[PDB]
Amino acid sequence: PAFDKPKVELHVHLDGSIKPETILYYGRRRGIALPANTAEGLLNVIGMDKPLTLPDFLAKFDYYMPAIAGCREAIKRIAYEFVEMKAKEGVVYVEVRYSPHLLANSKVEPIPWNQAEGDLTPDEVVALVGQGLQEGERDFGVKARSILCCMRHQPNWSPKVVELCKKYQQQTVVAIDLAGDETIPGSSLLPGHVQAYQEAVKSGIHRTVHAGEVGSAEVVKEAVDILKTERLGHGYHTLEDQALYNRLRQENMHFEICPWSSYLTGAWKPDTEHAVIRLKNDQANYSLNTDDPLIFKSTLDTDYQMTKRDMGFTEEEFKRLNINAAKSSFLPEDEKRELLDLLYKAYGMPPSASAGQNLA
Ligand SMILES: Nc1ncnc2c1ncn2[C@H]1C[C@H](O)[C@@H](CO)O1
Ligand code: NI
């Protein structure tokens, strides 16, 4: 591997990380049609080898989400399996994000994936995911927390999302996100979203927002100034605007960078220099992340190898950015200190002296 040491991942979607064998198993067990009859064939349909666009990417979910949504057993299992698989990438801490509405079949309007109304609500989805993450953390040694996504095209869901972040804050939920199609005009300003983020600020719920992935620097401004985000998902197009980038650097904004994702969605064109190179050269605050590894056919090694091979990233930079990811995590401060101590020890840095420097 490019970096065979402990890693921290902050930007990865549970519903974009499901095992193809688990999809196949539940499609068969539930009698729900899939576009292939083996895992290899599923990856041929669902996976991406070449850049498309963000909407073409988002459409991949339609192929497999029906097999998983609405099933309590499948939901808890994909959470458990998510932790097990991330252990294999050398991850020691992961925040995994998802829309609970997109896994439910009741108390969600409109009901997703052409499901009939059932008895599984978004609230119970969150309980189930938390349980699978907690059991995975216990069995596999990877600390795992969750982030609940508002979706840009459904501001009606956002009050419930922040409600659930508050309800489940001691059952792994550490933050709220906003995901979906960033091009929807004025989507950042829809009252359901704005009010959910204000309620998050009031109630001490941490905040991340997908912005600048394929949207302009103006969407990033909305995320920062209107939604009060603490981290940016992707954030590449911040660099369209040198003044905005300067102000964000000054405030130590964390950028959740997804190098291979950014190629496959067309967010980053490969005949331009990747935004992460500027962040590295400027010693900015950022993390490396897989985003949707099922669809991108990737692991964190895909992103580390790309930055190492093509962008001259060194071991020292990989250590640095994982320490920044831990510092920018949405853990309580005690668990942050514990995570940092684990990284210092793994990295051969002096743990006491490093903790003492952090007091500044
Ligand atoms: N990086 C991304 N940018 C925008 N939207 C995204 C991204 N990854 C996933 N999605 C969508 C589809 C999922 O169902 C939903 C919840 O995980 O989020
Ligand atoms: Ni994402």
Side-chain angles (χ1 to χ4, degrees), residues 1-39 41-133 135-315 317-360:
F3 183 61
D4 212 2
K5 302 180 196 311
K7 297 167 197 67
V8 174
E9 187 171 22
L10 302 180
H11 188 118
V12 55
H13 296 249
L14 178 61
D15 54 349
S17 301
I18 297 170
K19 294 183 172 189
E21 289 287 336
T22 297
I23 291 163
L24 184 64
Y25 175 80
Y26 285 105
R28 189 186 301 110
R29 177 184 186 99
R30 300 179 72 194
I32 292 168
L34 287 172
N37 76 345
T38 64
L42 287 167
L43 288 176
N44 288 339
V45 178
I46 288 156
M48 292 174 72
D49 293 316
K50 296 178 75 173
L52 293 169
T53 65
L54 186 64
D56 286 357
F57 156 74
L58 291 168
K60 297 290 199 180
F61 287 81
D62 297 25
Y63 287 115
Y64 65 86
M65 288 290 278
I68 300 300
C71 176
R72 292 172 168 83
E73 288 170 22
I75 288 313
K76 185 174 178 179
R77 177 172 172 171
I78 62 170
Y80 187 70
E81 289 180 348
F82 176 80
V83 184
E84 179 174 40
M85 298 299 300
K86 283 288 164 175
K88 301 178 183 297
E89 300 176 26
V91 172
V92 293
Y93 177 68
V94 56
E95 291 173 359
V96 66
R97 68 188 63 186
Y98 64 99
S99 168
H101 291 78
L102 293 177
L103 288 168
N105 59 20
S106 62
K107 292 196 83 175
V108 48
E109 169 67 47
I111 298 174
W113 321 117
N114 201 39
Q115 303 174 96
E117 188 187 2
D119 66 5
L120 181 64
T121 65
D123 182 296
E124 186 176 354
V125 168
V126 178
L128 292 163
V129 172
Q131 292 163 38
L133 294 180
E135 295 175 2
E137 169 164 353
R138 178 194 68 206
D139 292 343
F140 309 121
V142 179
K143 176 170 292 194
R145 296 291 180 268
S146 59
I147 295 180
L148 309 185
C149 302
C150 302
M151 296 305 294
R152 284 182 179 277
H153 63 294
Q154 301 288 169
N156 64 324
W157 299 348
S158 296
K160 176 58 63 171
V161 177
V162 72
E163 176 197 349
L164 297 172
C165 295
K166 292 160 57 182
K167 182 178 176 169
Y168 289 100
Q169 60 182 291
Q170 309 301 347
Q171 297 177 46
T172 81
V173 182
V174 291
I176 189 161
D177 183 32
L178 179 64
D181 175 2
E182 196 186 333
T183 65
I184 296 166
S187 68
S188 302
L189 314 177
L190 294 169
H193 302 320
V194 173
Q195 288 171 12
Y197 274 74
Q198 280 290 108
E199 179 63 21
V201 173
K202 175 186 183 185
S203 298
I205 300 304
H206 283 302
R207 296 158 305 283
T208 186
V209 170
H210 279 76
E213 176 180 7
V214 302
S216 71
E218 291 303 307
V219 184
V220 170
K221 292 182 178 196
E222 289 162 357
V224 176
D225 293 338
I226 305 304
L227 303 177
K228 308 304 181 180
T229 200
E230 301 179 277
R231 306 198 313 230
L232 286 166
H234 300 287
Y236 314 122
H237 290 79
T238 299
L239 298 181
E240 290 175 348
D241 183 332
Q242 308 294 332
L244 176 59
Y245 170 62
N246 190 20
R247 171 211 169 177
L248 299 187
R249 285 297 320 284
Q250 295 168 342
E251 294 167 22
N252 200 35
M253 170 62 65
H254 183 86
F255 295 84
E256 302 167 358
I257 299 293
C258 307
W260 178 243
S261 168
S262 74
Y263 170 63
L264 290 174
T265 64
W268 164 67
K269 310 310 193 196
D271 61 339
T272 66
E273 289 306 298
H274 201 285
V276 76
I277 285 164
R278 175 86 173 274
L279 303 176
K280 168 190 65 95
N281 287 338
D282 295 347
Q283 299 283 279
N285 177 15
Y286 72 94
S287 52
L288 293 183
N289 302 276
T290 62
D291 199 17
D292 297 272
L294 163 60
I295 292 165
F296 302 144
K297 302 195 293 179
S298 61
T299 63
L300 282 164
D301 191 51
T302 306
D303 299 274
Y304 283 76
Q305 178 68 19
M306 178 153 62
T307 54
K308 175 176 185 252
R309 189 191 87 169
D310 294 342
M311 313 180 189
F313 278 50
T314 61
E315 178 181 311
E317 182 64 5
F318 288 147
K319 287 180 179 179
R320 190 190 74 89
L321 72 86
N322 284 292
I323 288 165
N324 273 337
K327 290 176 174 177
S328 306
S329 68
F330 291 148
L331 285 165
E333 293 292 325
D334 50 8
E335 291 179 76
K336 276 207 191 161
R337 287 191 294 275
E338 184 183 343
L339 174 55
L340 285 163
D341 186 66
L342 174 163
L343 295 176
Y344 297 138
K345 288 173 168 159
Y347 294 169
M349 300 168 67
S352 282
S354 298
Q357 294 168 329
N358 290 344
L359 293 185

